[PDB]
């Protein structure tokens, strides 16, 4: 998109200029595209996600009872299905923001106070966003454990179908896997393999997330169960995703990377992974035979990406590791 | 302090509760002890700490003309001596200060523009304080890699000497050093050591942190620098810490660790480390043989301190250990 | 077979006590079973096997002109499909015993010349055996990097086909694999993971050796390739075993240690593993499932079993890591 | 004194030439130098050391009952000092040689038999040495532990001093140190260190070995200890090297580097290592700093070196080290 190797953030601040791309307004067919009252209802929340900058705490939105009562419905009803059809990671997940993060079914839950409770948990943060950003800048942004976030709630006609992704679809969808650590990592990884590939990388980068973290499926103690924030945020797909309707194959990151797929109607085709450290070892494998002159690896103590494109920046890397290594070993000595 | 084994925070979070303990106004022999218009000043600037969270942005301090003409003259005077008696990290962190955080003589730099550049530097961030903290909640402090910060400025009268820690010292003495790498980690570890550690165990670490943070002498290219916050802020020690004067020893942490000292006068005796890498590995031999049940590692994503107490915790740590490696042994292959 | 946790070898010293257990003589079916000349000539050779004490070179057989024809047939035929049917690891090690161990048509090469090439190459080494071991002591001489293995040739009358393992199958097929690195790692695990296990275990160990060691395939550009040894020396079981005729699963460790075997007539199914590093990885996982109080870590500088049974013994090992990633460390700053 | 990089051994095997390098026959001083019948044990003897192969047990040597005198003497007097004067790791050692190696003062053991202990005890063993090799020969022997150990007993006439190395020498001043890990490995990082290295920074690395392995004093529990053969072989040389007589100084790799020496008289200084830990992080630190365009590692599987000139040979390498950081991380879950 950009040059040889495209331009990429290397420092969680340059996200602010990963967001100059999305895509606004209503089509025909959606909920509320004839609601003059609901467009503005948009406008106005869009606007808290053009004005943000990295760093600001995320600016609450009053919710009025309408948009509380779409929100209570999705809830309930989706809330209904989880103990059957969702994955062990997202039942923790779940229970936890309820118990630090208000989630509940009368109140919408606020971004910041969700942000922060991602934040003490895996170290992920959340971004307001205007809605659908570019595959680049979206998985850029996965790259730093940041999510780009949407605010505003679907039509209040339609509460149980929503095409585009809504506060709901985010908040009951995506958040709650967030919440586990071998998940966070995976997410992250798939940001981290995007950062400077080419616009066809990205674009099989964008398959194998939407076939893991957008649909994907997984099995424990033998049973199949949903992880993927399409699924655990659609009544009727989860149900169906573990019917005996669609097909499921291995989940392998180079047969997802070239599987096509639409999204107004039901999936197919899902793969199920065998667990998540299975899972984000294939992906990591996969990211590995990805055409690149350089790795980046992600420094958590100041939200930046090194590139590793030398013996030097791997060395120092590696002290990292090894101070590291150096605490393990004094807390065998320390435990007998 | 608190029992067998002391409580200790273990999120950043809690740092809130390790604020509880201080000591305010002035002595007959401070400079402003008998101004009042400054004792209202400094209550003022006092109560932007006692009401600070973890988390919030940094509330900027409007500093009168007459602040900023006692800064001016700190600054001035040492600026003078630093390129002949600092070390080589301290002119590296204060260029940059001054290339990104408008460093100058004539404007006081705020806390949070501050906070900011040693987050994206080194992980680093300020919280103000209020003036003077524990010994256990400054080092606890230090293990989130939180520099427990002064806003108030000294009492205009005598510019060149300030019994108390004030933004001149932490800004011009502390901060730059807090930019490098080497040095962010060795202060971190001083304050990792001292998680639950008994009474006389943070006396020790206190004293460790007195003869290197506060006052510590390093050698460069066979020459003796300063590296001490309390010699980078003082026009008068800085001079006579690479004099003829004072008596200098290899620093090592156990000869440290029982060194008494006053802190009216100048130093007597000083500790040379050879280089932070060094120091860094003299130090964690020593809070090795510190009597403890578990050791501590930060996690950099959550701000969090884990506690290493079993096997599993310790295997649970060694796989961030070994996803790590897998990203080095990647790189490697990329750059051939 | 022995206690709790059944004795195990710790010091390769120790195998020459885990021989005391065959089985000798032919049977009715046997090629030579009704030919005294050459009942005579095994019990000469077993002898040497009987004899035998850990690290003496092993004694040269000199073979008699039948004996280096029965081989000349074994070997020219079999020549003839590893080309096309053989993995790349049989190519490449059998061209390096050509290159190095005077593999060649009219001469059977001796053991002690065969060991000491293979210890150069992998740290393996060969152990005259008097033939059929028990399960364990098979697998523990493995976990040292031993390989017991049979000096006498098979009955002239049938030369294309035999029984027991023979030096030919020996030689031919297992010798060229033990050449490369993983494989050799590979194999010295299945061993290692036998160490002190229940008999169910070894049997579901000597299973899954079945499987790989003795009748593996494995893809490679997208072709199936042999590299068990019970394949790459029997010309007819290799034709077969790349046919459409029998059934070829995925390698999976669980799978393949409870698949039911004969060994008569040719294998109807045979597990492909998709690289040698992923079959590695697959086995590990599993004996990691493996319940065991300790585990165990080879020391290849005294050819000796470590157990690790507490946090002690694992930071004793932890720090030889820790020398190597130093090393690795300097390494890399050498070449810049 | 090869080429710009000199030959050096890959292989243990390659040890063979690296022998063609001596010096024979003794001097008008030397205890025998006027025995015909002694002249003629020697030649005997050395001939053992040019006739060996790398691999081959080594020829046991049937002591004359004058020869058994000269070593009951040199044994007898220095044990009397070991208890008193020797560091912990000769006394356990030497305690070892005892229990396991016939070690007494009526019998010279035999080589082959300490090699074999050593063997299993720290990876080392001994080849039989002719007497006095070239420093890059005898440094690029100890990189594969390899010890070149002479097989002779000094002139009786003066069986308390001894110019040349004896057998008495390297069995009572070598021999026992080799038994400790932390040693072993310091031993062979020096000759690791040594490996196509200039002739000027052998020289300066066998002046590091003549105070360290040959003469050199550590501390113990605040005491001071001989740890050098040089000094654990000579009656005199211990006593004064414990003595007020000579200067000791901290153990400092580019200090004893360049201290000067001589051989005839006992030594005016010493250096004094902390720990053996600490030495060998010391020498590696130093080995370091040596101008090399790669780095060496042993392959203690192969008796190899693995030269790390490029990202690739630093990854297999890693491999190798993530392999095991594997199996620890195995044994932690096991162990609970
Ligand atoms: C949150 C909102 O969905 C966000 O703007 C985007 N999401 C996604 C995206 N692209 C992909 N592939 N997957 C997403 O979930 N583009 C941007
Ligand atoms: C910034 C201010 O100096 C801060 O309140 C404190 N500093 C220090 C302290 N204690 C020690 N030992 N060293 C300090 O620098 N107590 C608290
Ligand atoms: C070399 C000879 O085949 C050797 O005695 C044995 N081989 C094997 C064995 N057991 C198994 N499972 N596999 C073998 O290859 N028992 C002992
Ligand atoms: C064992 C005998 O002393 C051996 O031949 C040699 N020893 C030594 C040597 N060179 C040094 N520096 N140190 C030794 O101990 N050259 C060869
Ligand atoms: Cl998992
Ligand atoms: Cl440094
Ligand atoms: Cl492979
Ligand atoms: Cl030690
Ligand atoms: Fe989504
Ligand atoms: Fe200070
Ligand atoms: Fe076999
Ligand atoms: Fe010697």
Not at 260 to 266: A, I, K, L, V
């Amino acid at each position: 998109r950009e040059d040889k190797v495209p331009w990429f953030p290397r420092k969680v601040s340059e996200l602010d200029k990963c967001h100059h791309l999305v895509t606004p307004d209503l089509d025909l067919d959606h909920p509320g595209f004839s609601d003059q009252v609901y467009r503005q209802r948009r406008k106005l929340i869009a606007e808290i996600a053009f004005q943000y900058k990295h760093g600001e705490p995320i600016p609450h939105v009053e919710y009025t009872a309408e948009e509380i009562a779409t929100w209570k419905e999705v809830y309930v009803t989706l809330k209904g299905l989880y103990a059957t059809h969702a994955c062990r990671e997202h039942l923790e997940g779940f229970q936890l923001l309820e118990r630090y993060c208000g989630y509940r079914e009368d109140s919408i839950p606020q971004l910041e106070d969700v942000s922060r409770f991602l934040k003490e948990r895996t170290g992920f943060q959340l971004r307001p966003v205007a809605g659908l950003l570019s595959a680049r800048d979206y998985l850029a942004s996965l790259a730093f454990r940041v999510f780009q976030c949407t605010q505003y709630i679907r039509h209040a006609s339609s509460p149980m179908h929503s095409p585009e992704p809504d506060c709901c679809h985010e908040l009951l969808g995506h958040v709650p896997m967030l919440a586990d650590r071998t998940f966070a990592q995976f997410s992250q990884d798939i940001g981290l393999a995007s950062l400077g590939a080419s616009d066809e990388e990205i674009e099989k980068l964008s398959t194998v997330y939407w076939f893991t973290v957008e649909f994907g499926l997984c099995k424990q103690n033998g049973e199949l169960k949903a992880y993927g924030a399409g699924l655990l945020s659609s009544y009727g797909e989860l149900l169906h995703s573990l019917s005996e309707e669609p097909e499921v194959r291995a989940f392998d990151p180079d047969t997802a990377a070239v599987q096509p797929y639409q999204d107004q109607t039901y999936q197919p085709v899902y793969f199920v992974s065998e667990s998540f450290n299975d899972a984000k070892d294939k992906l990591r494998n996969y990211a590995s035979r990805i055409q690149r002159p350089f790795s980046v690896k992600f420094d958590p103590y100041t939200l930046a990406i090194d590139v590793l494109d030398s013996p030097h920046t791997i060395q120092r890397s590696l002290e990292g590791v090894q101070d590291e290594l150096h605490t393990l070993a004094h807390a065998l000595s320390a435990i007998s």
